[PDB]
Amino acid sequence: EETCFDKYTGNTYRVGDTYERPKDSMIWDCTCIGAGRGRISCTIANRCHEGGQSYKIGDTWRRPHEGGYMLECVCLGNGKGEWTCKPI
């Protein structure tokens, strides 16, 4: 019967449920903790957010060097949403 409600997903969760949440132009990994308070813990630490997009650990993507060559970027995570871009 104990639930969390997430207005960003519009869904009701049980204790221990995990889900993805859209917020602040990023995707968060959230967990319904409950604690009698609908408590939710969410994080972006295990995803990368660059150039307005959201990436998972191991994803790579391309972007022009703001020039004028392409960069290849990779999502590392390392507990702080770390990503790196270098010329290819």
């Binding site: 409600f5 207005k7 609908g38 813990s41 949403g81 790196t84 871009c85 010329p87």
Partner: peptide, 18 residues
């Protein structure tokens, strides 16, 4: 040539919804 590395601070949140 440039290299760029990004990360996030304040990356983990807790809120109550009930």
């Amino acid at each position: 040539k440039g290299i760029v590395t990004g990360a996030v601070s304040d990356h983990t949140t807790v809120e109550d919804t009930k």
